[PDB]
Design a protein around this ligand. Structure first.
Ligand SMILES: CC(C)(C)C1CCN(CCCn2nc(-c3ccc(C(F)(F)F)c(CNCc4ccc(F)cc4)c3)c3c2CCN(S(C)(=O)=O)C3)CC1
Length: 220
């Protein structure tokens, strides 16, 4: 059976909320966020990974268009093919498309593999958050209510299962009967609950939370 709540921030596996700005790089933040937890698990050290490095280098070959959109899965592939990703401190985020500046001497993480989960299976997503770590997902964030969210379990009746915004599920729980997912966003600390949104869980793949989940792995 499975725990009723998880919160990977309680285990020191989640870095500070980031601020993506004008650049549509939510997918890159989603991807490094998921790897950051796998890295802390392996090495005991928590270090922010370079979303910029994903924006600049995981490009045409991986189906990504930097600040105009991308995929977490093909971001994980880039890190696999590239044999590393830099630390955020060495390759800081600039919220704009740049030429690729990966330097292997400031390699902060590796990626061995990644796994995609079945569309719409929130029980499968729940198991992965418990047993594997935080999971990269997309959500439907194209609703005034999403931007305006300040607290509580977010439920948007007009939300769809088509995803357009990359985020990280770092836990799940329940708030007085309302089951939720704990979601790390990349809109700074002034968004929602210090940068987190708790989204409706077990409500028919609400906002496409479980439409396209994936999580990376660092072996050995
Ligand atoms: C590259 C390769 C090998 C051919 C892959 C083929 C498999 N796969 C595509 C299909 C799976 N998939 N993945 C996503 C998916 C997952 C996460 C996210 C994110 F929000 F987190 F960012 C997004 C949003 N960004 C889209 C974006 C991508 C590149 C760009 F430039 C510009 C924008 C989409 C979707 C689908 C299906 C269609 N939809 S939809 C409306 O929801 O049905 C979305 C990824 C590419």
């Amino acid at each position: 059976i499975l725990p009723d709540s998880v919160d990977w921030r309680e285990k020191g596996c989640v870095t500070e909320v980031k601020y993506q700005g004008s650049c549509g790089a939510s997918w890159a933040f989603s991807a490094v966020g998921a790897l950051e937890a796998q890295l802390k698990l392996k090495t005991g050290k928590l270090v922010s990974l370079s979303a910029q490095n994903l924006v600049d280098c995981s490009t045409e070959k991986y189906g990504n268009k930097g600040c105009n959109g991308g995929f977490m899965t093909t971001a994980f592939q880039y890190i696999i093919d590239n044999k590393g990703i830099d630390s955020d401190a060495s390759y800081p985020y600039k919220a704009m498309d740049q030429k690729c500046q990966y330097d292997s001497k400031y390699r902060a993480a590796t990626c061995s593999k990644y796994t995609e989960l079945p569309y719409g299976r929130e029980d499968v997503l729940k198991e992965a958050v418990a047993n594997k770590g935080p999971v990269s997902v997309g959500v439907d964030a194209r609703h005034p209510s999403f931007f305006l969210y300040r607290s509580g379990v977010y439920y948007e009746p007009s939300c769809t299962q088509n995803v357009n915004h990359g985020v990280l599920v770092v836990g799940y729980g329940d708030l007085n009967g309302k089951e939720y997912w704990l979601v790390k966003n990349s809109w700074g600390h002034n968004f929602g609950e210090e940068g987190y949104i708790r989204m409706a869980r077990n409500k028919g793949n609400h906002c496409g939370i479980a439409s396209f989940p994936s999580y990376p792995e660092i072996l050995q």
